[PDB]
Amino acid sequence: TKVKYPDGFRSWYHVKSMVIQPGHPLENPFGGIHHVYANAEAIQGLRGGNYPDGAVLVFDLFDYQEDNHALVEGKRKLIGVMERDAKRFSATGGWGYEGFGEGKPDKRLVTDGGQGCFGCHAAQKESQYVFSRLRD
Amino acid sequence: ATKVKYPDGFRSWYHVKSMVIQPGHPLENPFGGIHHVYANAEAIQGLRGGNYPDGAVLVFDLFDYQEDNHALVEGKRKLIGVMERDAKRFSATGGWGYEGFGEGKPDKRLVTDGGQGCFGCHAAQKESQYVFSRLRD
Ligand code: HEC
Ligand code: HEC
Ligand SMILES: [Zn+2]
């Protein structure tokens, strides 16, 4: 029913990164530099298999500071989490969605059972609701 | 110096940090783009405040980016820079060997001077064993 905090996510495989700057549609509240991490089970789905139960993707979001035309990572704003479990999270397409303010376990952000996150991710139905693609 | 080994499988290693260097910045040429730093297990012992065992490898992975409606999106890989720790083998440049691979390709080795040019800049970080990156949370 609740998404588990993903302890140890920082040592998982770095899928990709992206910078969202002011003015982008997703600025609020996804503005900043973000990195996507996948555990072993999520890698299987990214590589083209089905996502097994227990797959986890993390969206790791940092503020940045612009300093002499370099963007430098500042403080972590939040993490977004998707946890695969076809049965428990069937209401939201088999993924449970949670946000943790500042990446801390006790700061849960989602208040609508994940429906809001799910409504945008539904656009990626064809890729099992995941936007990120593996690059080399 | 012997050759620095191409770091096979580095994409699976621990992601240390990232930074974006944009036009105007002093390092735009040649380090412009979005870069990511990776470290293998031995390098982590060194980054943690331990000492660096021989066999520690750090990788700087550099991508061009594109601007897309107030997002910077990663484009093509321009190169990877590699530091491979071997105190005796690479003593001429501080115990680390330095190599670049154009577009990340094993056959596109870039360094022609034994790593002296790369070392000239990293020597500023003598105090941290020639490594600029710091571990974060
Ligand atoms: C559209 C309006 C979105 C909403 C609302 C949410 N997310 Fe999403 N998310 C979106 C995009 C475009 C992306 C891809 C970013 C990229 O670098 O390409 C993401 C990514 C994630 C991920 C990473 C896995 C993936 O699908 O690519 C996670 C773990 C994730 N998002 C979680 C998440 C949660 C918990 C949300 C509600 C609190 C949520 N997202 C909303 C677009 C949108
Ligand atoms: C100054 C003019 C530099 C020269 C020349 C080279 N590098 Fe360097 N390097 C420099 C900086 C400021 C940084 C830090 C980037 C960051 O995000 O903080 C780096 C980093 C690396 C790394 C990563 C490990 C570390 O020291 O932080 C590697 C593996 C690396 N650089 C390799 C490398 C090689 C192979 C070079 C010559 C081909 C080289 N660097 C030159 C600054 C400068
Ligand atoms: Zn605009």
From TrEMBL, chain A:
<keyword id="KW-0862">Zinc</keyword>
<dbReference type="InterPro" id="IPR038142">
    <property type="entry name" value="Cytochrome_P460_sp"/>
</dbReference>
<feature type="binding site">
    <location>
        <position position="120"/>
    </location>
    <ligand>
        <name>heme c</name>
    </ligand>
</feature>
<feature type="binding site">
    <location>
        <position position="69"/>
    </location>
    <ligand>
        <name>Zn(2+) 3</name>
    </ligand>
</feature>
<keyword id="KW-0408">Iron</keyword>
<protein>
    <submittedName>
        <fullName>Cytochrome c</fullName>
    </submittedName>
</protein>
<feature type="binding site">
    <location>
        <position position="131"/>
    </location>
    <ligand>
        <name>heme c</name>
    </ligand>
</feature>
<keyword id="KW-0479">Metal-binding</keyword>
<dbReference type="Pfam" id="PF16694">
    <property type="entry name" value="Cytochrome_P460"/>
</dbReference>
<feature type="binding site">
    <location>
        <position position="16"/>
    </location>
    <ligand>
        <name>heme c</name>
    </ligand>
</feature>
<feature type="binding site">
    <location>
        <position position="66"/>
    </location>
    <ligand>
        <name>Zn(2+) 2</name>
    </ligand>
</feature>
<feature type="binding site">
    <location>
        <position position="121"/>
    </location>
    <ligand>
        <name>heme c</name>
    </ligand>
</feature>
<feature type="binding site">
    <location>
        <position position="34"/>
    </location>
    <ligand>
        <name>heme c</name>
    </ligand>
</feature>
<feature type="binding site">
    <location>
        <position position="69"/>
    </location>
    <ligand>
        <name>Zn(2+) 2</name>
    </ligand>
</feature>
<keyword id="KW-0349">Heme</keyword>
<feature type="domain" description="Cytochrome P460">
    <location>
        <begin position="6"/>
        <end position="132"/>
    </location>
</feature>
<feature type="binding site">
    <location>
        <position position="117"/>
    </location>
    <ligand>
        <name>heme c</name>
    </ligand>
</feature>
<feature type="binding site">
    <location>
        <position position="132"/>
    </location>
    <ligand>
        <name>heme c</name>
    </ligand>
</feature>
<dbReference type="GO" id="GO:0046872">
    <property type="term" value="F:metal ion binding"/>
</dbReference>
<dbReference type="InterPro" id="IPR032033">
    <property type="entry name" value="Cytochrome_P460"/>
</dbReference>
<feature type="binding site">
    <location>
        <position position="27"/>
    </location>
    <ligand>
        <name>Zn(2+) 1</name>
    </ligand>
</feature>
